[PDB]
């Protein structure tokens, strides 16, 4: 795996942006997010038929693409999944089920994308050690997936803000609810990347309101990870930073991929890439944690991949020559 990365979302749908065939992605991701395995009634039993080929001919184009370098990755959830393990019934068929898909198409790791049904229950209170049995589950889940596979299976997550840099302000309910679960599987963890979009506005390390869609905040949302932080107001409680190339930016590719903004032009997010890697300022108000910079910051995710063909390619171009040009 590559020091600078482009994930992309891969939808396996057609939401008006129409299909991509696998072999048919830009060379420019270095992984593929396929979207998205779902569940039907017992909310537990992950399921996940391919758009288009036979399953032998989604199988072979993911193999192609594995012998090209890139990784091809199953995503849980989005916008519209749903997975609930209350206890360990649901836990063992979502583990089950993940892994047989896994094994039937030959996908190289999976991306946690839930956004819906995960909350921090009252008295739920340290992410060291959770009690909510959601997140206990979920957290056991992953590991046992993970160690399911080899040397570099992929484990990677898209949680929003909320659920993460929230934490900096509440511990509770969906505020922080994903800290847990970080905590949980970091020594498993190879990257995430935070949906820094449908966003609004995140508080940073320096108590400043930012607004999504402009570099300073996505500086200010990134250092949470790579710096660390205290949780929900306790100075006692501090998150610990991930390595930093454990950390990416989720981001829309074009100003369509994310309705309700987010969007960032690649000028602009240029500003915060360098500030973030090289400690390179661009006048803004949001002051780095590191001012030399933290040079291993993984890179970029997008949703989606098919968004930025739609889009004059403009998010997977101008950040591939970007990493590239470092
Ligand atoms: C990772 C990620 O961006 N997850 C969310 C996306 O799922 C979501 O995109 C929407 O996904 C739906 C399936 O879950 C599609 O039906 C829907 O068409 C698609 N919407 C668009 C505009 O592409 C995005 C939307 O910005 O939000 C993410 O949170």
Redesign the pocket.
């Known amino acids: 795996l590559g020091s600078k990365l482009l994930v992309g ?1 891969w939808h396996n ?1 057609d ?1 008006g ?1 129409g299909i991509i065939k696998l072999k048919d992605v830009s060379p420019k991701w270095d992984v593929i997010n396929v ?2 395995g779902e569940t039907g009634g017992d909310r537990s039993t992950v399921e996940f038929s391919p758009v288009y080929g036979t399953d032998a001919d989604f199988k072979s184009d993911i193999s192609y693409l594995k012998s090209k370098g890139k990784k091809v990755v199953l ?1 849980i959830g ?4 749903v997975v609930l393990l209350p206890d360990n019934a649901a836990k063992d068929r979502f583990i089950n089920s993940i892994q047989s898909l896994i094994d039937k198409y030959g996908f190289d790791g999976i991306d946690i ?1 839930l ?1 819906s049904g995960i909350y921090l229950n009252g008295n739920d209170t340290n992410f060291k050690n959770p009690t909510t049995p959601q997140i206990v589950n979920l957290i056991s889940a992953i590991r046992t997936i993970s160690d399911h596979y080899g040397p570099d299976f992929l484990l990677s997550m ?1 949680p ?1 803000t909320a659920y993460v840099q929230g934490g900096y302000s509440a511990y509770g309910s969906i505020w922080g609810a994903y800290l847990p679960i970080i905590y949980g599987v970091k020594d498993k963890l190879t990257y995430i990347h935070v ?1 820094h ?2 966003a609004g506005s995140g508080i940073g390390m320096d108590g400043n309101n930012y607004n999504q869609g402009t570099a300073d905040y996505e500086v200010a949302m990134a250092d949470m990870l790579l710096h660390g932080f205290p949780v929900g107001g306790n100075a006692n409680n501090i998150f610990p930073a991930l390595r930093s190339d454990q950390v990416m930016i ?1 981001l ?1 590719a074009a100003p ?4 309700s903004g987010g969007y960032i032009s690649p000028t602009e997010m240029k500003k915060a890439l360098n500030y973030i890697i090289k400690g390179v300022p661009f006048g803004g108000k949001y002051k780095l944690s590191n001012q030399s910079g933290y040079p291993a910051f993984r890179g970029l995710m997008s ?2 991949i098919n ?1 930025d063909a739609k889009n004059n390619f403009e998010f997977s171009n101008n950040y591939r020559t970007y990493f590239d040009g470092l």
């Open positions: 979302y749908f939401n942006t979207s998205f995503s989005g916008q519209n999944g994308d956004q898209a929003e949906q979009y449908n989720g829309p369509a991929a994310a309705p949703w989606s968004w």
